[PDB]
Amino acid sequence: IIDADLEAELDVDVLAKAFNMNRTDFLGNVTVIDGFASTGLEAVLVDKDW
Amino acid sequence: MRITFNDVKTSLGITESYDIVNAIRNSQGDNFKSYVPLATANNVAEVGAGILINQTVQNDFITSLVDRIGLVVIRQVSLNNPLKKFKKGQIPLGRTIEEIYTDITKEKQYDAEEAEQKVFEREMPNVKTLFHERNRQGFYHQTIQDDSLKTAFVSWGNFESFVSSIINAIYNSAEVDEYEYMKLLVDNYYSKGLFTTVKIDEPTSSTGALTEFVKKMRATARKLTLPQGSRDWNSMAVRTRSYMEDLHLIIDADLEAELDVDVLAKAFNMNRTDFLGNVTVIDGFASTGLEAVLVDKDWFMVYDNLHKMETVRNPRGLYWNYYYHVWQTLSVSRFANAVAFVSGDVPAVTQVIVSPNIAAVKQGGQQQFTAYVRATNAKDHKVVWSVEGGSTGTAITGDGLLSVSGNEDNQLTVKATVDIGTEDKPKLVVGEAVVSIRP
């Protein structure tokens, strides 16, 4: 779970993510939200049974 | 009537750079040595570029006979307007199209004790309406002289092919005009400034500008694709959603080629539709600052009302006149997502939208208005409310609550105003709503 702005920022500046676009074997199922509410939160990586 | 031509050469219009025949003949190791073994190169080079005006050529064996035309080819090149996929069905009867949108409501907490005395309470649904009407009428006129044209062909198949080519030319002209009108739609929308403006630097200034533009487009496309929706990308300030397969990006060919090469992120996903949507390439825009526009498939609200062809004949002139009539309505939908990326200087605030743009209140009721400011910068702005009704006892608070006095008969207008200029040289942005009074 990541923010749209950060996801688009890292989809271009770094290439390793820009290679493995629209798949799951690299960073899991990437779902995009419109930001969090916590001050320091940037990304959250959880499990389906969470 | 004999229309003959004399003193015509095989080089009527030729801005020649060098004599290829001379270069081939005078070559002792140059790059033209590959054409030296060719037996007949002068003859090929003499008429290898086509002949604009032909002349009769005698036979090589018997000079009295004349060589004849063996093959006749008629070009069937057909052209289309790329935005045709955004069209809709036909409207044989009527003129006006009504678009109705229903917005979402709010949640209330379960309360059995409170639910005793308010079982029959009312919650007015939120609905918005937009209207479109027919605005384009035109026709195309052509003439065909069958009897006068019958002497230019020796085959009925060729005759029919030529007349079909004329009809196809009419259709091609119609398609070109339709494409131009569809471009005019976007240009007029941006001129009226109902887009959501995203400020960017000049892409051609430096490499970093191009990658910044690409990542900004990626972010905008993602937040448009978000399933839960947002109210920040349409002129009606309604909660709406768009699909990645329904998103289309309209960009200039030169800029598209520049960013297909300069930034390596766009090198991939060039034809996958999952990066920026269906990329449509046009021959540039008309506005000064417009670089790219990303709109939803439902943004276009174009229909056609008439598409017909009629013919008349002139007995004295022996020809047919063909009239192709096209009547269409071209309009856009304000409920659909639309973003425009502008490289030039843009104002701090683009527009102000009032959530109820039309109201009908009683003589003792109250109304609540919500103001949405489309600001191109991070800093926020303050909205001031005013009314221009006229009667005393009618007033609007600073939060957007309008109260109406018990004695007035006149239409009211409510203005939400934002100041974006500096001191003693102010620039103001105003959003207006209309209110009717019911006695």
Structure explained in plain terms:
This is part of a larger assembly, with two copies of chain A. Chain A is α+β, with helices and mostly antiparallel strands and 50 residues long. Chain A has two helices and two strands, in the order E-H-H-E. Chain A has a two-stranded parallel sheet with strand order 1-2. The longest helix of chain A has 7 residues, at 4-10. Chain A is flat and about 30 Å long. The A-B interface holds A 4-5, 7-9, 11-13, 15, 18-19, 21-22, 32-34 and B 211, 214-216, 218-219, 222-223, 226, 228, 230, 263-265, 268-269, 272, 274-275. The PDB classes it as virus. The entry lists the keywords bacteriophage, prohead, HK97 fold, virus. The entry is titled "Phi-29 expanded, DNA-packaged fiberless prohead". Chains A, B are Major capsid protein. Organism of A, B: Bacillus phage phi29. Method: cryo-EM, 3.0 Å.
Entry keywords:
part of a larger assembly, 2 chains, 50 residues, alpha+beta, two-stranded parallel ribbon, 2 helices, 2 strands, flat, virus, bacteriophage, prohead
Topology:
The structure is cut from a larger assembly and holds two copies of chain A.
Chain A: E1 2-3, H1 4-10, H2 15-19, E2 32-33
Parallel strand pairs in A: 1-2
PDB class: virus
Keywords: bacteriophage, prohead, HK97 fold, virus
Entry title: Phi-29 expanded, DNA-packaged fiberless prohead
